[PDB]
């Protein structure tokens, strides 16, 4: 079967089939869930500690901390 | 790596595996699965999404259809569990699981591990020992047993 790495191609194949959706950019993400002006927050991963974060209705958003998994903005 | 969490999952496994007698087959399923899990670009995507259905579908979707209905409803368990992220660990468990029944392996003495299937401790073991005739290989053994006896030794020097 896929033995070694044919899986990857299979993966590729497997991917290629479903492939389209994956990834995103630094500076690019989406705010997933929130309450109280603080947001589960995604994308834009590499940034400087507490850089200003352009908001729609544009404003920067206050950046608390970088969690490993995902982080939210103030 | 809760991995202990494996059991209720992992356990029903062998049983289903027992009952389903798939373990050749189920074993296949597991191979396939850990493979699927491994996918890293996928992995980023993998925790991406909230809707469990979405993942059961998409995961199952690109999967290449190695899936089983029991493994569909059941995969649906792991996703419904939401715990599924870590699943590959179970294979290790499953190994032991598979191993558990009748299996044996080996620890290298000073060289390399035969992993011989020998179920009699110190006997089937001894059978392998004698079976050397593999007596040939050095593979760091001498430094090891001389250094380890030497270690007990300097240990006694300290004791001295």
PDB file of C-alpha atoms in Angstrom:
ATOM      1  CA  UNK A   1       0.000   0.000   0.000  1.00  0.00           C
ATOM      2  CA  UNK A   2       1.084   3.575   0.664  1.00  0.00           C
ATOM      3  CA  UNK A   3       4.005   1.947   2.445  1.00  0.00           C
ATOM      4  CA  UNK A   4       6.275   4.908   2.956  1.00  0.00           C
ATOM      5  CA  UNK A   5       5.382   8.365   1.787  1.00  0.00           C
ATOM      6  CA  UNK A   6       3.089   7.147  -0.907  1.00  0.00           C
ATOM      7  CA  UNK A   7       0.822   7.931   1.972  1.00  0.00           C
ATOM      8  CA  UNK A   8       2.065  11.495   1.583  1.00  0.00           C
ATOM      9  CA  UNK A   9       1.124  11.339  -2.058  1.00  0.00           C
ATOM     10  CA  UNK A  10      -1.970   9.578  -0.874  1.00  0.00           C
ATOM     11  CA  UNK A  11      -2.045  12.419   1.617  1.00  0.00           C
ATOM     12  CA  UNK A  12      -1.390  14.752  -1.272  1.00  0.00           C
ATOM     13  CA  UNK A  13      -4.045  12.794  -3.119  1.00  0.00           C
ATOM     14  CA  UNK A  14      -6.101  12.633   0.046  1.00  0.00           C
ATOM     15  CA  UNK A  15      -5.328  16.300   0.511  1.00  0.00           C
ATOM     16  CA  UNK A  16      -5.619  17.134  -3.154  1.00  0.00           C
ATOM     17  CA  UNK A  17      -9.124  15.764  -3.021  1.00  0.00           C
ATOM     18  CA  UNK A  18     -10.110  17.916  -0.059  1.00  0.00           C
ATOM     19  CA  UNK A  19      -7.013  20.053  -0.330  1.00  0.00           C
ATOM     20  CA  UNK A  20      -8.321  23.532  -0.919  1.00  0.00           C
ATOM     21  CA  UNK A  21      -9.033  24.822   2.533  1.00  0.00           C
ATOM     22  CA  UNK A  22      -5.782  24.814   4.449  1.00  0.00           C
ATOM     23  CA  UNK A  23      -3.736  27.591   6.199  1.00  0.00           C
ATOM     24  CA  UNK A  24      -3.464  31.407   6.304  1.00  0.00           C
ATOM     25  CA  UNK A  25      -0.995  34.268   6.739  1.00  0.00           C
ATOM     26  CA  UNK A  26       0.665  36.055   9.542  1.00  0.00           C
ATOM     27  CA  UNK A  27      -1.257  39.315   9.903  1.00  0.00           C
ATOM     28  CA  UNK A  28      -4.150  37.144   8.711  1.00  0.00           C
ATOM     29  CA  UNK A  29      -6.568  35.197  10.868  1.00  0.00           C
ATOM     30  CA  UNK A  30     -10.063  35.373  12.304  1.00  0.00           C
ATOM     31  CA  UNK A  31     -11.544  36.160  15.715  1.00  0.00           C
ATOM     32  CA  UNK A  32     -13.273  32.964  16.692  1.00  0.00           C
ATOM     33  CA  UNK A  33     -15.290  33.568  19.837  1.00  0.00           C
ATOM     34  CA  UNK A  34     -15.378  36.300  22.409  1.00  0.00           C
ATOM     35  CA  UNK A  35     -17.162  37.892  25.234  1.00  0.00           C
ATOM     36  CA  UNK A  36     -16.673  41.183  27.004  1.00  0.00           C
ATOM     37  CA  UNK A  37     -14.407  42.735  24.410  1.00  0.00           C
ATOM     38  CA  UNK A  38     -11.854  39.937  24.675  1.00  0.00           C
ATOM     39  CA  UNK A  39     -11.601  37.471  21.843  1.00  0.00           C
ATOM     40  CA  UNK A  40     -10.552  34.021  21.111  1.00  0.00           C
ATOM     41  CA  UNK A  41      -8.222  35.010  18.368  1.00  0.00           C
ATOM     42  CA  UNK A  42      -6.477  33.358  15.488  1.00  0.00           C
ATOM     43  CA  UNK A  43      -4.007  33.971  12.706  1.00  0.00           C
ATOM     44  CA  UNK A  44      -1.279  36.549  12.366  1.00  0.00           C
ATOM     45  CA  UNK A  45       0.849  34.386  14.517  1.00  0.00           C
ATOM     46  CA  UNK A  46       4.430  35.668  14.607  1.00  0.00           C
ATOM     47  CA  UNK A  47       3.879  39.225  15.676  1.00  0.00           C
ATOM     48  CA  UNK A  48       5.682  41.481  18.115  1.00  0.00           C
ATOM     49  CA  UNK A  49       4.490  41.361  21.677  1.00  0.00           C
ATOM     50  CA  UNK A  50       1.477  43.624  21.891  1.00  0.00           C
ATOM     51  CA  UNK A  51       1.634  45.241  18.481  1.00  0.00           C
ATOM     52  CA  UNK A  52      -1.386  47.372  17.698  1.00  0.00           C
ATOM     53  CA  UNK A  53      -4.011  45.201  16.031  1.00  0.00           C
ATOM     54  CA  UNK A  54      -6.091  46.855  13.354  1.00  0.00           C
ATOM     55  CA  UNK A  55      -9.732  46.305  14.072  1.00  0.00           C
ATOM     56  CA  UNK A  56     -12.598  46.603  11.648  1.00  0.00           C
ATOM     57  CA  UNK A  57     -14.378  49.852  12.297  1.00  0.00           C
ATOM     58  CA  UNK A  58     -10.777  50.342  12.371  1.00  0.00           C
ATOM     59  CA  UNK A  59      -8.803  50.500  15.522  1.00  0.00           C
ATOM     60  CA  UNK A  60      -5.883  48.652  16.937  1.00  0.00           C
ATOM     61  CA  UNK A  61      -6.727  45.917  19.397  1.00  0.00           C
ATOM     62  CA  UNK A  62      -4.918  45.476  22.673  1.00  0.00           C
ATOM     63  CA  UNK A  63      -2.768  42.360  22.699  1.00  0.00           C
ATOM     64  CA  UNK A  64      -2.553  40.652  26.057  1.00  0.00           C
ATOM     65  CA  UNK A  65      -0.362  37.620  25.622  1.00  0.00           C
ATOM     66  CA  UNK A  66       0.741  34.923  23.258  1.00  0.00           C
ATOM     67  CA  UNK A  67      -0.671  31.615  24.274  1.00  0.00           C
ATOM     68  CA  UNK A  68       0.897  28.634  22.621  1.00  0.00           C
ATOM     69  CA  UNK A  69      -2.310  27.227  21.185  1.00  0.00           C
ATOM     70  CA  UNK A  70      -4.305  30.353  20.395  1.00  0.00           C
ATOM     71  CA  UNK A  71      -4.723  33.773  21.857  1.00  0.00           C
ATOM     72  CA  UNK A  72      -7.240  36.514  22.224  1.00  0.00           C
ATOM     73  CA  UNK A  73      -7.122  40.243  22.042  1.00  0.00           C
ATOM     74  CA  UNK A  74      -8.176  43.008  24.329  1.00  0.00           C
TER      75      UNK A  74
ATOM     76  CA  UNK B   1      -0.139  12.219  26.446  1.00  0.00           C
ATOM     77  CA  UNK B   2      -2.803  11.393  28.942  1.00  0.00           C
ATOM     78  CA  UNK B   3      -2.595   8.029  27.213  1.00  0.00           C
ATOM     79  CA  UNK B   4      -4.043   6.443  30.287  1.00  0.00           C
ATOM     80  CA  UNK B   5      -7.260   7.876  28.975  1.00  0.00           C
ATOM     81  CA  UNK B   6      -6.584   5.405  26.200  1.00  0.00           C
ATOM     82  CA  UNK B   7      -8.036   2.472  28.037  1.00  0.00           C
ATOM     83  CA  UNK B   8     -11.832   2.860  27.876  1.00  0.00           C
ATOM     84  CA  UNK B   9     -11.360   3.685  24.284  1.00  0.00           C
ATOM     85  CA  UNK B  10      -8.317   1.464  23.956  1.00  0.00           C
ATOM     86  CA  UNK B  11      -9.962  -1.314  25.938  1.00  0.00           C
ATOM     87  CA  UNK B  12     -13.187  -1.552  23.980  1.00  0.00           C
ATOM     88  CA  UNK B  13     -10.733  -1.739  21.115  1.00  0.00           C
ATOM     89  CA  UNK B  14      -9.286  -5.145  21.859  1.00  0.00           C
ATOM     90  CA  UNK B  15     -12.775  -6.293  22.763  1.00  0.00           C
ATOM     91  CA  UNK B  16     -14.316  -5.010  19.592  1.00  0.00           C
ATOM     92  CA  UNK B  17     -11.078  -6.200  18.048  1.00  0.00           C
ATOM     93  CA  UNK B  18     -11.689  -9.479  19.840  1.00  0.00           C
ATOM     94  CA  UNK B  19     -15.371  -9.443  18.995  1.00  0.00           C
ATOM     95  CA  UNK B  20     -14.881  -7.983  15.549  1.00  0.00           C
ATOM     96  CA  UNK B  21     -11.775 -10.172  15.162  1.00  0.00           C
ATOM     97  CA  UNK B  22     -10.529  -7.406  12.928  1.00  0.00           C
ATOM     98  CA  UNK B  23      -7.133  -7.139  14.545  1.00  0.00           C
ATOM     99  CA  UNK B  24      -5.572  -7.932  11.236  1.00  0.00           C
ATOM    100  CA  UNK B  25      -8.232  -5.643   9.789  1.00  0.00           C
ATOM    101  CA  UNK B  26      -8.551  -3.302  12.749  1.00  0.00           C
ATOM    102  CA  UNK B  27      -4.771  -3.251  12.853  1.00  0.00           C
ATOM    103  CA  UNK B  28      -4.997  -2.053   9.305  1.00  0.00           C
ATOM    104  CA  UNK B  29      -7.462   0.614  10.368  1.00  0.00           C
ATOM    105  CA  UNK B  30      -5.036   1.810  13.023  1.00  0.00           C
ATOM    106  CA  UNK B  31      -2.079   1.891  10.700  1.00  0.00           C
ATOM    107  CA  UNK B  32      -4.180   3.909   8.292  1.00  0.00           C
ATOM    108  CA  UNK B  33      -5.340   6.193  11.042  1.00  0.00           C
ATOM    109  CA  UNK B  34      -2.045   7.117  12.650  1.00  0.00           C
ATOM    110  CA  UNK B  35      -0.977   7.812   9.131  1.00  0.00           C
ATOM    111  CA  UNK B  36      -3.902  10.181   8.686  1.00  0.00           C
ATOM    112  CA  UNK B  37      -3.239  11.862  12.015  1.00  0.00           C
ATOM    113  CA  UNK B  38       0.371  12.408  11.119  1.00  0.00           C
ATOM    114  CA  UNK B  39      -0.585  14.949   8.509  1.00  0.00           C
ATOM    115  CA  UNK B  40       0.857  18.241   9.676  1.00  0.00           C
ATOM    116  CA  UNK B  41      -0.471  20.740   7.186  1.00  0.00           C
ATOM    117  CA  UNK B  42      -3.609  18.845   7.949  1.00  0.00           C
ATOM    118  CA  UNK B  43      -2.678  19.084  11.599  1.00  0.00           C
ATOM    119  CA  UNK B  44      -2.763  22.860  11.608  1.00  0.00           C
ATOM    120  CA  UNK B  45      -6.145  22.539  10.015  1.00  0.00           C
ATOM    121  CA  UNK B  46      -6.897  19.712  12.382  1.00  0.00           C
ATOM    122  CA  UNK B  47      -7.670  21.699  15.491  1.00  0.00           C
ATOM    123  CA  UNK B  48      -8.961  24.475  13.288  1.00  0.00           C
ATOM    124  CA  UNK B  49     -12.657  23.765  13.338  1.00  0.00           C
ATOM    125  CA  UNK B  50     -15.478  23.651  15.874  1.00  0.00           C
ATOM    126  CA  UNK B  51     -18.150  21.633  14.095  1.00  0.00           C
ATOM    127  CA  UNK B  52     -17.456  17.967  14.881  1.00  0.00           C
ATOM    128  CA  UNK B  53     -19.544  16.836  11.967  1.00  0.00           C
ATOM    129  CA  UNK B  54     -17.323  18.946   9.733  1.00  0.00           C
ATOM    130  CA  UNK B  55     -14.275  16.986  10.782  1.00  0.00           C
ATOM    131  CA  UNK B  56     -15.830  13.541  10.809  1.00  0.00           C
ATOM    132  CA  UNK B  57     -16.862  14.335   7.283  1.00  0.00           C
ATOM    133  CA  UNK B  58     -13.711  16.005   6.042  1.00  0.00           C
ATOM    134  CA  UNK B  59     -11.279  13.754   7.845  1.00  0.00           C
ATOM    135  CA  UNK B  60     -13.262  10.701   6.838  1.00  0.00           C
ATOM    136  CA  UNK B  61     -13.496  12.417   3.481  1.00  0.00           C
ATOM    137  CA  UNK B  62      -9.960  12.829   2.164  1.00  0.00           C
ATOM    138  CA  UNK B  63      -9.253   9.623   4.081  1.00  0.00           C
ATOM    139  CA  UNK B  64      -9.135   7.171   1.227  1.00  0.00           C
ATOM    140  CA  UNK B  65     -11.987   5.192   2.719  1.00  0.00           C
ATOM    141  CA  UNK B  66     -10.094   2.690   4.762  1.00  0.00           C
ATOM    142  CA  UNK B  67     -12.862   3.367   7.269  1.00  0.00           C
ATOM    143  CA  UNK B  68     -15.294   0.963   8.887  1.00  0.00           C
ATOM    144  CA  UNK B  69     -18.871   1.559   9.900  1.00  0.00           C
ATOM    145  CA  UNK B  70     -18.091   0.452  13.424  1.00  0.00           C
ATOM    146  CA  UNK B  71     -15.158   2.783  12.961  1.00  0.00           C
ATOM    147  CA  UNK B  72     -17.454   5.421  11.523  1.00  0.00           C
ATOM    148  CA  UNK B  73     -19.961   5.469  14.353  1.00  0.00           C
ATOM    149  CA  UNK B  74     -16.964   4.921  16.589  1.00  0.00           C
ATOM    150  CA  UNK B  75     -14.712   7.520  15.003  1.00  0.00           C
ATOM    151  CA  UNK B  76     -17.757   9.648  15.590  1.00  0.00           C
ATOM    152  CA  UNK B  77     -17.251   8.596  19.178  1.00  0.00           C
ATOM    153  CA  UNK B  78     -13.694   9.953  19.308  1.00  0.00           C
ATOM    154  CA  UNK B  79     -14.756  13.195  17.663  1.00  0.00           C
ATOM    155  CA  UNK B  80     -17.858  13.383  19.783  1.00  0.00           C
ATOM    156  CA  UNK B  81     -15.296  12.738  22.450  1.00  0.00           C
ATOM    157  CA  UNK B  82     -13.401  15.572  20.851  1.00  0.00           C
ATOM    158  CA  UNK B  83     -10.465  13.843  22.442  1.00  0.00           C
ATOM    159  CA  UNK B  84      -9.566  12.283  19.128  1.00  0.00           C
ATOM    160  CA  UNK B  85      -6.639  14.648  18.565  1.00  0.00           C
ATOM    161  CA  UNK B  86      -4.195  12.414  20.407  1.00  0.00           C
ATOM    162  CA  UNK B  87      -5.494   9.074  19.104  1.00  0.00           C
ATOM    163  CA  UNK B  88      -2.286   7.601  17.663  1.00  0.00           C
ATOM    164  CA  UNK B  89      -1.083   6.895  21.195  1.00  0.00           C
ATOM    165  CA  UNK B  90      -3.580   4.065  21.363  1.00  0.00           C
ATOM    166  CA  UNK B  91      -1.809   2.189  18.600  1.00  0.00           C
ATOM    167  CA  UNK B  92       1.118   2.014  20.952  1.00  0.00           C
ATOM    168  CA  UNK B  93      -1.339   0.796  23.498  1.00  0.00           C
ATOM    169  CA  UNK B  94      -2.945  -1.280  20.761  1.00  0.00           C
ATOM    170  CA  UNK B  95       0.478  -2.728  20.160  1.00  0.00           C
ATOM    171  CA  UNK B  96       0.673  -3.811  23.753  1.00  0.00           C
ATOM    172  CA  UNK B  97      -2.977  -4.677  23.247  1.00  0.00           C
ATOM    173  CA  UNK B  98      -2.104  -6.862  20.300  1.00  0.00           C
ATOM    174  CA  UNK B  99       1.095  -7.758  22.110  1.00  0.00           C
ATOM    175  CA  UNK B 100      -0.764  -8.575  25.274  1.00  0.00           C
ATOM    176  CA  UNK B 101      -2.332 -11.753  24.000  1.00  0.00           C
ATOM    177  CA  UNK B 102       0.626 -13.851  23.088  1.00  0.00           C
ATOM    178  CA  UNK B 103       3.749 -11.950  22.249  1.00  0.00           C
ATOM    179  CA  UNK B 104       7.301 -11.426  23.270  1.00  0.00           C
ATOM    180  CA  UNK B 105      10.208  -9.130  22.461  1.00  0.00           C
ATOM    181  CA  UNK B 106      13.700  -8.499  23.814  1.00  0.00           C
ATOM    182  CA  UNK B 107      15.967  -5.896  25.407  1.00  0.00           C
ATOM    183  CA  UNK B 108      19.426  -5.694  23.886  1.00  0.00           C
ATOM    184  CA  UNK B 109      21.994  -7.080  26.169  1.00  0.00           C
ATOM    185  CA  UNK B 110      24.797  -4.669  25.548  1.00  0.00           C
ATOM    186  CA  UNK B 111      24.218  -4.828  21.778  1.00  0.00           C
ATOM    187  CA  UNK B 112      20.849  -4.976  20.004  1.00  0.00           C
ATOM    188  CA  UNK B 113      17.398  -6.167  20.927  1.00  0.00           C
ATOM    189  CA  UNK B 114      16.243  -9.429  19.399  1.00  0.00           C
ATOM    190  CA  UNK B 115      12.584  -8.759  20.156  1.00  0.00           C
ATOM    191  CA  UNK B 116      12.278 -12.524  19.886  1.00  0.00           C
ATOM    192  CA  UNK B 117       8.815 -13.873  20.507  1.00  0.00           C
ATOM    193  CA  UNK B 118       9.679 -15.962  23.510  1.00  0.00           C
ATOM    194  CA  UNK B 119       7.040 -16.198  26.180  1.00  0.00           C
ATOM    195  CA  UNK B 120       9.033 -18.025  28.867  1.00  0.00           C
ATOM    196  CA  UNK B 121      10.928 -15.535  30.959  1.00  0.00           C
ATOM    197  CA  UNK B 122      14.521 -16.619  31.493  1.00  0.00           C
ATOM    198  CA  UNK B 123      13.517 -19.752  29.611  1.00  0.00           C
ATOM    199  CA  UNK B 124      12.324 -18.762  26.188  1.00  0.00           C
ATOM    200  CA  UNK B 125      14.693 -15.982  27.062  1.00  0.00           C
ATOM    201  CA  UNK B 126      17.379 -18.534  27.871  1.00  0.00           C
ATOM    202  CA  UNK B 127      16.424 -20.204  24.612  1.00  0.00           C
ATOM    203  CA  UNK B 128      17.416 -17.023  22.844  1.00  0.00           C
ATOM    204  CA  UNK B 129      20.593 -16.628  24.883  1.00  0.00           C
ATOM    205  CA  UNK B 130      21.777 -20.093  24.055  1.00  0.00           C
ATOM    206  CA  UNK B 131      20.476 -19.370  20.579  1.00  0.00           C
ATOM    207  CA  UNK B 132      23.561 -17.256  20.280  1.00  0.00           C
ATOM    208  CA  UNK B 133      25.227 -18.469  17.841  1.00  0.00           C
ATOM    209  CA  UNK B 134      24.231 -14.908  17.565  1.00  0.00           C
ATOM    210  CA  UNK B 135      27.184 -14.875  19.945  1.00  0.00           C
ATOM    211  CA  UNK B 136      29.114 -13.128  17.182  1.00  0.00           C
ATOM    212  CA  UNK B 137      28.291  -9.449  17.538  1.00  0.00           C
ATOM    213  CA  UNK B 138      30.180  -6.959  19.710  1.00  0.00           C
ATOM    214  CA  UNK B 139      28.010  -3.851  19.217  1.00  0.00           C
ATOM    215  CA  UNK B 140      29.437  -1.960  22.234  1.00  0.00           C
ATOM    216  CA  UNK B 141      28.824  -4.979  24.500  1.00  0.00           C
ATOM    217  CA  UNK B 142      32.362  -5.200  25.873  1.00  0.00           C
ATOM    218  CA  UNK B 143      32.635  -1.542  26.826  1.00  0.00           C
ATOM    219  CA  UNK B 144      29.234  -2.058  28.394  1.00  0.00           C
ATOM    220  CA  UNK B 145      29.701  -5.175  30.509  1.00  0.00           C
ATOM    221  CA  UNK B 146      33.332  -4.464  31.265  1.00  0.00           C
ATOM    222  CA  UNK B 147      32.419  -0.896  32.059  1.00  0.00           C
ATOM    223  CA  UNK B 148      29.394  -1.984  34.035  1.00  0.00           C
ATOM    224  CA  UNK B 149      31.172  -4.668  35.974  1.00  0.00           C
ATOM    225  CA  UNK B 150      33.826  -1.987  36.195  1.00  0.00           C
ATOM    226  CA  UNK B 151      31.018   0.177  37.441  1.00  0.00           C
ATOM    227  CA  UNK B 152      30.086  -2.216  40.204  1.00  0.00           C
ATOM    228  CA  UNK B 153      33.809  -2.331  40.728  1.00  0.00           C
ATOM    229  CA  UNK B 154      34.652   1.302  41.151  1.00  0.00           C
ATOM    230  CA  UNK B 155      31.414   1.186  43.076  1.00  0.00           C
ATOM    231  CA  UNK B 156      33.202  -1.120  45.476  1.00  0.00           C
ATOM    232  CA  UNK B 157      36.273   1.077  45.292  1.00  0.00           C
ATOM    233  CA  UNK B 158      34.044   3.778  46.635  1.00  0.00           C
ATOM    234  CA  UNK B 159      32.919   1.076  49.011  1.00  0.00           C
ATOM    235  CA  UNK B 160      36.581   0.481  49.694  1.00  0.00           C
TER     236      UNK B 160
END
